[PDB]
Amino acid sequence: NLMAEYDLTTRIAHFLDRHLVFPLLEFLSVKEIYNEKELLQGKLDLLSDTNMVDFAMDVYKNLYSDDIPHALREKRTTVVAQLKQLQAETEPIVKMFEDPETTRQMQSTRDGRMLFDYLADKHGFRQEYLDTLYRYAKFQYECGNYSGAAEYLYFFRVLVPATDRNALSSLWGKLASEILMQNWDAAMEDLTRLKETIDNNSVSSPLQSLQQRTWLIHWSLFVFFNHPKGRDNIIDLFLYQPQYLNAIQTMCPHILRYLTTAVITNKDVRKRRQVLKDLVKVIQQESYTYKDP
Amino acid sequence: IMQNTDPHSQEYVEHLKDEAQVCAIIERVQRYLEEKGTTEEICRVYLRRILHTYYKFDYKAHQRQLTPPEGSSKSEQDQAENEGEDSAVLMERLCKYIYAKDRTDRIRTCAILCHIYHHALHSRWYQARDLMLMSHLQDNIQHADPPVQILYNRTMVQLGICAFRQGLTKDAHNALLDIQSSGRAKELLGQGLLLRSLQERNQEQEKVERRRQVPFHLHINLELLECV
Amino acid sequence: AKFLTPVIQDNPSGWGPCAVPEQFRDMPYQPFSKGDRLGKV
């Protein structure tokens, strides 16, 4: 009961994508802190809104019986029909990216406008094909094909102007896909680009910018605890950036656990002693909203 | 009436009995406008209901905290009359509706000041502080109307008294410093004129400042303020 | 100990929050610092 009192999984999950919650639920199942039946029910409820129908059927069998509900079989049939339709719509677009000349141009050209104009002139590429590629990447992600989703979101991100409505969502989807693949070096690069995009957005409301930073803080935990430079980046991001410190103090005071742990576990004794004075002030300011051991 | 009756006569206590009837009429008119009213009429009644509740210390909420329910059995009828919605929950509901639906920066500004005053009156310093800081009213209040400035000055005194009740002597001193060091605290709080300034003012300005005075049952004792 | 699944907001149109948190829906956004000095007369 005391172990469950300090569990942050439910609080963190509110700022995560559904697919990023499954590794946390698997960790709780291995720790036997919660009732396994209630944990499997919560896993089933989260899977019900995903396209991972085969995984939902396996969880349902473990919870109830081998009798798979008609609704799950019908959902499987619908998902397979949508997959075939989206594959047929995306097949001509994927063939344009398989051209070895296009692949060289994508690696050499950093300007997405020039790359779009080149594809438009050579292959008749259109803006509608980017929206089809984005929908296909989302569908592959919802099916649990994170490697395919990361590849299609990479093509989308290189071609899309930074002002597109889906530009920010594509950075989030690529970061989620790289985290789920455990590609921590690529996830660190995508986290840095996502951060720079959020911090350089001058048109978003202060409230939207706060929400985006709050989500970035939670998603960054996966990257920073698994990447060898992550512990230093937690300190520099959460304690020394006023925008992120304000997001922690306002929306997510429970992140002070991770910040405190990153300061205490820091390898540089000089950095640790200097940073600790500023950490103590922040902990003392939030001691009315958040307390843990 | 409560600006023109003497504060020390028995007649003041008699006219204060009618305040309960005024509060009941405003509640009847609130319920009626929640069913049929426009959002701009609702936000105005919510401000009037807030205005007669924000200064009243909820002795019923405090009595409910002083008797934990250890063990005596009486009547389900005495429970239905105890489901009187806490002055704090009512204040939070009415204020959140104003913040989400108000088209006027005035009604919003009065509601946040009454909300901070009601948190400060109930020893809830952290909530009152965080609402005051989030509002950024410290910079903007200099251009607001003088009755809203009097409400802000009364809310700042109440924040200083709330910090003092929490043992935060430094933050209490800081919040009260400018008000008491002015030598004009009675005027800044709308509690009267200082006789020493009567010699320097126009009779027409004095007659407008007298109408801006808060009733005596809304005063914060200046001797309590100076002692704190 | 009952494991309660955290409420995750799903965004089908992009990466990030799809709605303002309920705690801030009815509040005009103004940035403030808890270190700012109170007590302006």
Tab-separated table of C-alpha atoms in Angstrom, chain A:
chain	number	residue	atom	x	y	z
A	1	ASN	CA	0.000	0.000	0.000
A	2	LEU	CA	2.891	2.459	0.745
A	3	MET	CA	4.499	1.638	-2.643
A	4	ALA	CA	1.252	2.526	-4.453
A	5	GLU	CA	0.970	5.885	-2.569
A	6	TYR	CA	4.096	7.211	-4.370
A	7	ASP	CA	3.272	5.722	-7.807
A	8	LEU	CA	3.263	8.490	-10.443
A	9	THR	CA	2.136	6.249	-13.373
A	10	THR	CA	-1.465	7.582	-13.405
A	11	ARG	CA	-0.261	11.238	-13.166
A	12	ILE	CA	2.410	10.801	-15.885
A	13	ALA	CA	0.021	8.892	-18.202
A	14	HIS	CA	-2.204	12.027	-18.477
A	15	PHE	CA	0.650	13.716	-20.456
A	16	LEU	CA	1.649	10.669	-22.570
A	17	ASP	CA	0.464	8.979	-25.743
A	18	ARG	CA	-1.472	5.683	-25.204
A	19	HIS	CA	1.360	3.607	-26.735
A	20	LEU	CA	3.915	5.133	-24.266
A	21	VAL	CA	1.737	3.998	-21.290
A	22	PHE	CA	2.006	0.262	-22.157
A	23	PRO	CA	5.710	-0.045	-21.006
A	24	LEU	CA	4.705	1.579	-17.660
A	25	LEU	CA	1.783	-0.868	-17.204
A	26	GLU	CA	4.101	-3.830	-17.997
A	27	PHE	CA	6.550	-2.550	-15.336
A	28	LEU	CA	3.713	-2.329	-12.745
A	29	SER	CA	2.599	-5.899	-13.632
A	30	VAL	CA	6.171	-7.245	-13.051
A	31	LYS	CA	6.347	-5.341	-9.703
A	32	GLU	CA	3.034	-6.886	-8.466
A	33	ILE	CA	2.060	-3.592	-6.711
A	34	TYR	CA	-1.489	-3.594	-8.137
A	35	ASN	CA	-4.131	-6.268	-8.696
A	36	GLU	CA	-3.159	-7.956	-11.993
A	37	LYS	CA	-6.856	-8.282	-13.064
A	38	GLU	CA	-7.457	-4.520	-12.637
A	39	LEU	CA	-4.134	-3.830	-14.453
A	40	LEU	CA	-5.147	-6.120	-17.373
A	41	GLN	CA	-8.578	-4.382	-17.487
A	42	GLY	CA	-6.877	-0.954	-17.651
A	43	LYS	CA	-4.571	-2.317	-20.415
A	44	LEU	CA	-7.633	-3.613	-22.331
A	45	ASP	CA	-9.437	-0.235	-22.024
A	46	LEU	CA	-6.332	1.559	-23.432
A	47	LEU	CA	-5.999	-1.024	-26.265
A	48	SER	CA	-9.697	-0.627	-27.251
A	49	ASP	CA	-8.955	2.765	-28.905
A	50	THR	CA	-5.815	1.468	-30.729
A	51	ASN	CA	-5.523	-0.623	-33.930
A	52	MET	CA	-3.525	-3.315	-31.971
A	53	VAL	CA	-6.458	-5.770	-32.143
A	54	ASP	CA	-4.279	-8.926	-31.840
A	55	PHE	CA	-2.737	-7.623	-28.585
A	56	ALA	CA	-6.217	-6.664	-27.285
A	57	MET	CA	-7.423	-10.258	-28.018
A	58	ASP	CA	-4.468	-11.771	-26.061
A	59	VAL	CA	-5.148	-9.455	-23.049
A	60	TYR	CA	-8.896	-10.342	-23.250
A	61	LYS	CA	-8.079	-14.119	-23.173
A	62	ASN	CA	-5.838	-13.649	-20.105
A	63	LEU	CA	-8.568	-11.629	-18.290
A	64	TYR	CA	-11.809	-13.508	-19.117
A	65	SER	CA	-11.834	-16.530	-21.491
A	66	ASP	CA	-10.620	-17.884	-24.864
A	67	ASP	CA	-13.977	-16.748	-26.361
A	68	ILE	CA	-13.012	-13.665	-28.350
A	69	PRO	CA	-15.945	-11.180	-28.551
A	70	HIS	CA	-17.572	-10.604	-31.948
A	71	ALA	CA	-16.773	-6.857	-31.653
A	72	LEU	CA	-12.961	-7.553	-31.605
A	73	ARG	CA	-13.239	-9.822	-34.727
A	74	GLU	CA	-15.278	-7.171	-36.520
A	75	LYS	CA	-12.720	-4.459	-35.514
A	76	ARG	CA	-9.906	-6.698	-36.911
A	77	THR	CA	-11.765	-6.964	-40.252
A	78	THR	CA	-12.250	-3.152	-40.396
A	79	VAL	CA	-8.559	-2.453	-39.496
A	80	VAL	CA	-7.327	-4.904	-42.197
A	81	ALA	CA	-9.664	-3.252	-44.770
A	82	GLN	CA	-8.375	0.262	-43.838
A	83	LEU	CA	-4.751	-1.017	-44.006
A	84	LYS	CA	-5.284	-2.317	-47.588
A	85	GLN	CA	-6.985	0.927	-48.670
A	86	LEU	CA	-4.239	3.168	-47.198
A	87	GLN	CA	-1.494	0.908	-48.672
A	88	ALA	CA	-3.083	1.244	-52.148
A	89	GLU	CA	-3.303	5.081	-51.771
A	90	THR	CA	0.317	5.344	-50.450
A	91	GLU	CA	1.984	2.851	-52.867
A	92	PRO	CA	2.529	5.476	-55.673
A	93	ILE	CA	4.002	7.920	-53.071
A	94	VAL	CA	6.396	5.311	-51.558
A	95	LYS	CA	7.644	4.460	-55.104
A	96	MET	CA	8.658	8.148	-55.552
A	97	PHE	CA	10.835	7.936	-52.379
A	98	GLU	CA	12.449	4.611	-53.464
A	99	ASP	CA	14.097	6.427	-56.430
A	100	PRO	CA	17.877	6.468	-55.574
A	101	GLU	CA	18.161	10.003	-57.048
A	102	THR	CA	15.363	11.276	-54.741
A	103	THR	CA	17.036	9.563	-51.730
A	104	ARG	CA	20.352	11.385	-52.511
A	105	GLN	CA	18.510	14.704	-52.928
A	106	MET	CA	16.725	14.224	-49.525
A	107	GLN	CA	20.099	13.627	-47.788
A	108	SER	CA	21.876	16.572	-49.513
A	109	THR	CA	19.119	19.238	-49.539
A	110	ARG	CA	18.192	20.773	-46.143
A	111	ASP	CA	15.592	23.097	-47.690
A	112	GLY	CA	12.176	21.384	-47.657
A	113	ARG	CA	10.784	23.898	-50.219
A	114	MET	CA	13.489	23.084	-52.806
A	115	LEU	CA	12.971	19.352	-52.159
A	116	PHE	CA	9.179	19.724	-52.605
A	117	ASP	CA	9.655	21.731	-55.852
A	118	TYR	CA	12.087	19.035	-57.123
A	119	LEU	CA	9.553	16.247	-56.363
A	120	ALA	CA	6.703	18.307	-57.891
A	121	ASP	CA	8.673	18.909	-61.135
A	122	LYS	CA	10.083	15.343	-61.436
A	123	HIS	CA	7.238	13.156	-60.075
A	124	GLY	CA	4.196	15.523	-59.957
A	125	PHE	CA	4.235	15.450	-56.127
A	126	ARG	CA	1.318	17.349	-54.451
A	127	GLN	CA	0.391	18.615	-50.976
A	128	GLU	CA	-2.431	15.959	-50.888
A	129	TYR	CA	0.306	13.251	-50.941
A	130	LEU	CA	1.831	14.671	-47.706
A	131	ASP	CA	-1.612	14.426	-46.002
A	132	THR	CA	-1.935	10.806	-47.284
A	133	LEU	CA	1.606	9.982	-46.040
A	134	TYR	CA	0.757	11.520	-42.621
A	135	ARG	CA	-2.512	9.503	-42.340
A	136	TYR	CA	-0.599	6.332	-43.312
A	137	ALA	CA	2.113	7.059	-40.687
A	138	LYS	CA	-0.620	7.538	-38.002
A	139	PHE	CA	-2.295	4.264	-39.045
A	140	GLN	CA	1.046	2.356	-38.924
A	141	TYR	CA	1.678	3.801	-35.429
A	142	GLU	CA	-1.830	2.767	-34.205
A	143	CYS	CA	-1.068	-0.778	-35.505
A	144	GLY	CA	2.216	-0.831	-33.463
A	145	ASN	CA	4.522	-0.617	-36.553
A	146	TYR	CA	6.739	2.082	-34.996
A	147	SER	CA	9.643	1.588	-37.485
A	148	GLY	CA	7.374	2.236	-40.488
A	149	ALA	CA	5.706	5.164	-38.688
A	150	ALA	CA	9.144	6.756	-37.946
A	151	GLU	CA	10.226	6.385	-41.618
A	152	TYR	CA	7.019	7.918	-43.076
A	153	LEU	CA	7.097	10.742	-40.470
A	154	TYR	CA	10.746	11.395	-41.464
A	155	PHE	CA	9.697	11.846	-45.136
A	156	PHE	CA	6.751	14.035	-44.052
A	157	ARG	CA	8.970	16.224	-41.785
A	158	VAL	CA	11.617	16.828	-44.508
A	159	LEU	CA	9.012	17.988	-47.082
A	160	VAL	CA	6.456	19.807	-44.894
A	161	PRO	CA	6.799	23.573	-44.275
A	162	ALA	CA	7.260	24.444	-40.560
A	163	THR	CA	3.888	26.337	-40.678
A	164	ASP	CA	1.805	23.249	-41.590
A	165	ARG	CA	-0.883	22.223	-39.024
A	166	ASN	CA	0.601	18.684	-38.873
A	167	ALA	CA	4.273	19.830	-38.572
A	168	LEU	CA	4.210	19.860	-34.739
A	169	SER	CA	2.168	16.609	-34.508
A	170	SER	CA	4.674	14.875	-36.856
A	171	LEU	CA	7.568	15.790	-34.475
A	172	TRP	CA	5.611	14.294	-31.538
A	173	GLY	CA	4.755	11.131	-33.534
A	174	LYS	CA	8.391	10.649	-34.638
A	175	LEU	CA	9.637	11.128	-31.038
A	176	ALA	CA	7.056	8.583	-29.761
A	177	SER	CA	8.065	6.067	-32.491
A	178	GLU	CA	11.829	6.414	-31.719
A	179	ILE	CA	11.155	6.014	-27.931
A	180	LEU	CA	9.080	2.836	-28.550
A	181	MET	CA	11.909	1.465	-30.766
A	182	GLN	CA	14.439	2.300	-27.948
A	183	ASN	CA	16.505	4.355	-30.448
A	184	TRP	CA	17.761	6.793	-27.780
A	185	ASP	CA	20.241	8.662	-30.037
A	186	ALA	CA	17.574	9.427	-32.684
A	187	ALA	CA	15.031	10.179	-29.908
A	188	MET	CA	17.505	12.724	-28.387
A	189	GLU	CA	17.843	14.481	-31.789
A	190	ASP	CA	14.037	14.523	-32.282
A	191	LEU	CA	13.510	15.771	-28.690
A	192	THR	CA	15.966	18.641	-29.412
A	193	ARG	CA	14.135	19.581	-32.667
A	194	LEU	CA	10.722	19.364	-30.945
A	195	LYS	CA	11.994	21.568	-28.093
A	196	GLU	CA	13.422	24.167	-30.535
A	197	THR	CA	10.097	24.146	-32.457
A	198	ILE	CA	8.028	24.734	-29.261
A	199	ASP	CA	10.426	27.436	-27.920
A	200	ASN	CA	10.569	29.275	-31.304
A	201	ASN	CA	6.778	29.285	-31.799
A	202	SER	CA	5.846	32.987	-31.429
A	203	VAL	CA	2.230	32.574	-32.625
A	204	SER	CA	0.941	30.001	-30.109
A	205	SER	CA	-0.873	31.266	-27.012
A	206	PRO	CA	1.023	31.210	-23.659
A	207	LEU	CA	-1.425	28.472	-22.504
A	208	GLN	CA	-0.802	26.261	-25.569
A	209	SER	CA	2.972	26.804	-25.129
A	210	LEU	CA	2.639	25.773	-21.443
A	211	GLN	CA	0.736	22.587	-22.419
A	212	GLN	CA	3.313	21.702	-25.140
A	213	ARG	CA	6.220	22.196	-22.649
A	214	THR	CA	4.382	20.125	-19.992
A	215	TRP	CA	4.007	17.217	-22.446
A	216	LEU	CA	7.632	17.614	-23.648
A	217	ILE	CA	8.845	17.373	-19.997
A	218	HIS	CA	7.036	14.002	-19.506
A	219	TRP	CA	8.137	12.523	-22.872
A	220	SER	CA	11.729	13.673	-22.223
A	221	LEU	CA	11.927	11.349	-19.161
A	222	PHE	CA	12.074	8.286	-21.459
A	223	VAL	CA	15.009	9.780	-23.414
A	224	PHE	CA	16.940	11.402	-20.524
A	225	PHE	CA	16.991	8.333	-18.195
A	226	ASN	CA	18.122	5.997	-21.034
A	227	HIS	CA	20.595	8.321	-22.842
A	228	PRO	CA	24.125	8.695	-21.248
A	229	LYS	CA	23.959	12.562	-21.453
A	230	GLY	CA	20.311	12.654	-20.272
A	231	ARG	CA	21.041	13.362	-16.553
A	232	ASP	CA	22.891	16.627	-17.408
A	233	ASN	CA	20.142	17.629	-19.887
A	234	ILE	CA	17.423	17.175	-17.172
A	235	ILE	CA	19.258	19.698	-14.935
A	236	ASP	CA	19.916	22.189	-17.751
A	237	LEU	CA	16.334	21.915	-19.143
A	238	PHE	CA	14.163	21.686	-15.998
A	239	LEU	CA	16.081	23.844	-13.474
A	240	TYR	CA	17.847	26.514	-15.597
A	241	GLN	CA	15.213	27.192	-18.298
A	242	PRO	CA	12.565	29.543	-16.803
A	243	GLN	CA	9.800	28.396	-19.204
A	244	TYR	CA	10.227	24.707	-18.277
A	245	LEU	CA	10.689	25.476	-14.567
A	246	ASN	CA	7.405	27.445	-14.671
A	247	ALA	CA	5.683	24.502	-16.436
A	248	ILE	CA	6.961	22.149	-13.647
A	249	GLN	CA	5.813	24.529	-10.844
A	250	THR	CA	2.380	25.179	-12.449
A	251	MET	CA	1.300	21.928	-14.160
A	252	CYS	CA	3.576	19.044	-13.131
A	253	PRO	CA	5.215	19.453	-9.645
A	254	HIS	CA	5.670	15.617	-9.538
A	255	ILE	CA	8.588	16.070	-12.049
A	256	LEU	CA	10.591	17.445	-9.057
A	257	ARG	CA	11.186	13.736	-8.142
A	258	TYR	CA	13.074	13.183	-11.413
A	259	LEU	CA	14.890	16.550	-11.249
A	260	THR	CA	16.002	15.836	-7.633
A	261	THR	CA	17.184	12.321	-8.583
A	262	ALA	CA	19.096	13.691	-11.617
A	263	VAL	CA	20.860	16.309	-9.385
A	264	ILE	CA	21.749	13.764	-6.636
A	265	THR	CA	22.986	11.123	-9.162
A	266	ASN	CA	25.072	13.653	-11.163
A	267	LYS	CA	28.692	12.482	-11.716
A	268	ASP	CA	30.258	15.974	-11.456
A	269	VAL	CA	30.594	16.806	-7.730
A	270	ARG	CA	31.141	20.543	-8.558
A	271	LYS	CA	28.004	20.797	-10.725
A	272	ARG	CA	26.044	18.827	-8.056
A	273	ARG	CA	27.009	21.293	-5.228
A	274	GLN	CA	26.253	24.382	-7.348
A	275	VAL	CA	22.885	23.138	-8.679
A	276	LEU	CA	21.691	21.857	-5.262
A	277	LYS	CA	21.209	25.444	-3.921
A	278	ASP	CA	18.788	26.287	-6.738
A	279	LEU	CA	17.041	22.878	-6.483
A	280	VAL	CA	16.374	23.442	-2.719
A	281	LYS	CA	14.618	26.780	-3.477
A	282	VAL	CA	12.347	25.131	-6.074
A	283	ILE	CA	11.515	22.161	-3.763
A	284	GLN	CA	10.742	24.599	-0.912
A	285	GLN	CA	8.435	26.667	-3.208
A	286	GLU	CA	6.473	23.544	-4.283
A	287	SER	CA	6.441	21.807	-0.818
A	288	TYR	CA	2.726	22.753	-0.462
A	289	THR	CA	1.669	21.043	-3.777
A	290	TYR	CA	4.031	18.054	-3.963
A	291	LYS	CA	5.737	15.850	-1.366
A	292	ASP	CA	7.499	12.508	-1.783
A	293	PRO	CA	10.396	10.773	0.103
